[model samples]
Target: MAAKVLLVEDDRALREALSDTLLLGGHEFVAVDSAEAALPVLAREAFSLVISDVNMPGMDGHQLLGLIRTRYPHLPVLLMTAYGAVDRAVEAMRQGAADYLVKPFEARALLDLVARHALG
Candidate 1:
């Protein structure tokens, strides 16, 4: 089954790359430039998974994760960042994120993670 995925990132190139990568994995992809833009879409659409970048101009991934946890408790959210900080990753997991990924990660790894968490 094809899974629907929401991707929030400020970096246009990375967003487009990941969108194409997800498409290659046969997952439906929705790309948003900011977490603020992502919120309404999440409310209006049904997604199997959410993948968000930790850094953004407004409403970073951590804050977005918190809101998603409160408003859509069952939804699985994956947070990613260019900073490969262990503490940040731990913090994300502690705050209820489904998983965390560092930047420059393999597309195959991302596809595997999405496949593991995406609802069938």
Candidate 2:
């Protein structure tokens, strides 16, 4: 089954790239640039999964994850971190994130990870 995925990332290129990958994998994709922008969208729509970048200009991924955990406790959030930010990713997992992706990651890996957590 196709999953609806909400993606939050400040980098335009990376957001588009991830969007394309998700689309190619047959998932519905909604891309937002910041954690702040993502909140309203989340409130309005229901998604099967949420994928957010760890570092952004305002209201970083950790904060977003916290908000999601509080407001939508059962929603699975997957955080993306830079190559050397494994520690932060692990911390996110402890804080209730479904999983973490270490960038730059392959499209295959991303699809696989999404498949593991995305709800029908």
Candidate 3:
């Protein structure tokens, strides 16, 4: 997207992989492992997008999305899940997520979606 992003993911492997992808796309990002950590960063920083995983240790992506809706209402959020339910993703969209990605998604595809949502 060539935009700054706040990436909230707890999985170290996926997080590292995506960070590389984001960098390759010329996107700047700050990543945190949990929504609790992300909440503070969101309060203090400016970002063009938020990319988060639906499953996490404490505060899940849905809850985080709720906070973002109430606080950074204009910010765009992109969510992903390895195990997903169509209804939940639809609800996320209804609530205000910019997009939802299913896991095992190709990196290039994710980059495309990020560019679309973050820059356009």
- C-alpha lDDT values of all predictions: 0.91, 0.90, 0.89
| Candidate number achieving the greatest TM-score relative to the actual structure | 1
Residue range 13-74, candidate 2, lDDT tens digits:
99999999998899998899999999999999999999999889999899999999999998
Give the per-residue lDDT digits (tens) of candidate 1, residues 1-120: 788999999999999999989989989989999999998899899999999999999988999999999998888999999886888888889988989888888889889999898777
Per-residue C-alpha lDDT of model 3 across residues 1-120, encoded as one tens digit per residue = 269989999999999999998888888999899999998898788899999999999989999999998998889999999988989999999998998888977779877877888844
**Ten consecutive residues with minimal summed lDDT in candidate 1?**
83-92
Residue range with the least summed lDDT across 10 consecutive positions in model 3: 111-120
Name the candidate, 2 or 3, with the larger lDDT value.
Answer: 2
C-alpha positional error of residue 37 in candidate 3 after TM-score superposition, expressed in Å: 0.4
Clashes of each: 0, 0, 0
When sorted by TM-score, best at the front, the candidate numbers are 1, 3, 2
- Model 2 Cα RMSD, Å? 1.2
Clashing pairs in 1: none
**Number of the top-ranking candidate, with lDDT as the measure:** 1
lDDT of 1: 0.91
Residue 117 in model 1: shift from native, Å?
1.1
As a TM-score, model 1 comes out at 0.95
Quality of model 2 by C-alpha lDDT: 0.90
